């Protein structure tokens, strides 16, 4: 019986905020992934949160990568207005991401709950395969401040006082002229790209401090959205290398390897950097040149994310990071 902490402050101070609580797990072997099917009493969503089955291109590396059109369950592949229509009905969302070497798979489970349930949902249980997990809500004595290493921090609207706060981002795959995210990538990083080698359309949705209204990325006139964009794309490998007990970095960087996405591809659509040892970097991403978000799972591989060259690349699905915000204490 594991535990996941949902951090509730005493008050919310208006705003349609959702709280996020996530925790990682001890691992399981490689080929066990498909067995994982979660049950819950606090998924609460209309068959959309837990029942996330997605067409992936499993890249089994050997030796030598093997692309296979596989189907995965429980991933954090989010959809348009998912958080929103979850909020209006006071229902929840839950997903998990994976960091996998050639042999093992460390999970990371996020749960997203509207703040309208810091009192109703005081405790809960959710089971994922070999692990039960009690979802424990936990009150801090903060009014609305997020608890950051002993102090209650409160954005915004003010000398100025400013700190760095945690933020969780998930990619939402939506198609339309207004979602050409790679165009913003080019306009704000001066990489040598164009619109055909990079066609995936979508955006990111993020929550800050475990209690915040969602932040869409990118939007030009949002201070926090552009902060998140800078953070996400200056470290797409995730701004937290160290998973639960991986400070002594043993990255057997095996090296670059090509793969098809999907398996039926005529040539190699994705470049990767195979590794082994300790799984710390996430293993779920999305292929870039495909208009449809053709999701990719890569065990024992760091997919190519550096967009210095604008072809045969991938973008992360989830991302946990830190960005700068103005606040107050006492």
């Amino acid at each position, epitope marked *: 019986v594991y535990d996941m902490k949902i951090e509730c402050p005493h008050t919310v101070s208006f705003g349609e905020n959702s709280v996020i609580g996530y925790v990682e797990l001890p691992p399981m072997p490689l080929a066990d992934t498909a067995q994982m099917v979660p049950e819950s009493s606090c998924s609460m969503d209309n068959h959309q949160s837990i029942n996330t089955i997605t067409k992936y291109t499993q890249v089994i590396w050997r030796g030598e990568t093997v692309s296979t059109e596989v189907d995965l369950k429980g991933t954090c592949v989010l959809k348009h207005k998912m958080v929103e*229509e979850s909020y209006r009905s006071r229902k929840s969302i839950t997903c998990y991401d994976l960091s996998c070497n050639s042999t093992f798979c460390k999970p990371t489970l996020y749960m997203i709950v509207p703040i309208h349930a810091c009192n109703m949902m005081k405790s809960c249980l959710i089971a994922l395969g070999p692990y039960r997990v009690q979802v424990v809500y936990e009150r801090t004595y903060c009014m609305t401040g997020v608890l950051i290493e002993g102090k209650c921090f409160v954005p915004d609207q003010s000398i100025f006082d400013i700190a760095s706060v945690h933020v969780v981002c998930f990619f939402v795959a*939506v198609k*339309g002229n*207004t979602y050409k995210l790679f165009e913003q990538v080019k306009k704000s990083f001066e990489s040598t790209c164009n619109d055909t080698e990079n066609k995936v359309q979508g955006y990111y949705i993020c929550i800050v401090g475990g209690n915040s*209204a969602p932040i869409y990325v990118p939007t030009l*006139d949002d201070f926090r959205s552009m902060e998140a964009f800078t953070g996400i794309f200056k470290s797409p490998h995730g701004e937290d290398h160290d998973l639960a007990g991986e400070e002594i970095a043993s990255y057997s960087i095996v090296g670059p390897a090509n793969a098809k996405v999907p398996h039926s591809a005529s040539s190699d659509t994705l470049s990767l950097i195979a590794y082994s040892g300790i799984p710390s970097y996430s293993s779920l991403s999305i292929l870039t040149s495909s*208009t449809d978000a053709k999701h990719v799972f890569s065990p024992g591989l760091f997919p190519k994310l550096n967009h210095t060259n604008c072809d045969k690349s991938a973008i992360p699905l989830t991302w946990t990071g830190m960005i700068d915000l103005p606040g107050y204490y006492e």
Partner: antibody
Amino acid sequence: QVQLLESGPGLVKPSQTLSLTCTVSGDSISSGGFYWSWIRQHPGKGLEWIGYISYSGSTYYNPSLKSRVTISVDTSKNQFSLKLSSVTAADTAVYYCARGDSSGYNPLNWFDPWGQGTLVTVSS
Amino acid sequence: SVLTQPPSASGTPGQRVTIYCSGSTSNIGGNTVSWYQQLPSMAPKLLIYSNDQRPSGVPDRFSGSKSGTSASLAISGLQSEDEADYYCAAWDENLNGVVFGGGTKLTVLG
């Protein structure tokens, strides 16, 4: 690429019920989360939004035409439909279907993309 | 048409042509404006959303803005192919719907 396409009879006689159907392509209609909308435009005149429906069944009609407008949905077949009852010579217009979106949390804000429209003329 | 647009605006290439859209607190005071360009006898096309944002394939000649209950579309650097009809749209809560402006017939003279 995502495209919307309208279909229906070009002529509908007075005091009938007018039915039109918009079909989505490129995007899965259940991956939408969008406000699927009917808008019209009288000849030489401006624009007027008829109504919208969500992928669940939320019927949000214009107060002027909520008496007459009905909007069908078909999630299993990627379609939605408009049914304007009690049509007269006033309702002759170009009818467009649109994928209205709402950026953040507030309701309908913009329409992207558009179907290329269909001209429904009314005359006995 | 609850949103009030000027009927016609005009200019010559190289201008800064601005198109207006005035409503009340119930429509533009609390919700975003989107801007649409309709070419001669054609289906409309999104130009601005969220009051200033640009779709892909939209030139920053077209910028937008909104203050209080009134919005503007600024074509900074007018060009020949901009001879069309420009509509503004926003959500009105007291009417619980989406409202358009009267359109703006833009003429490129010279």
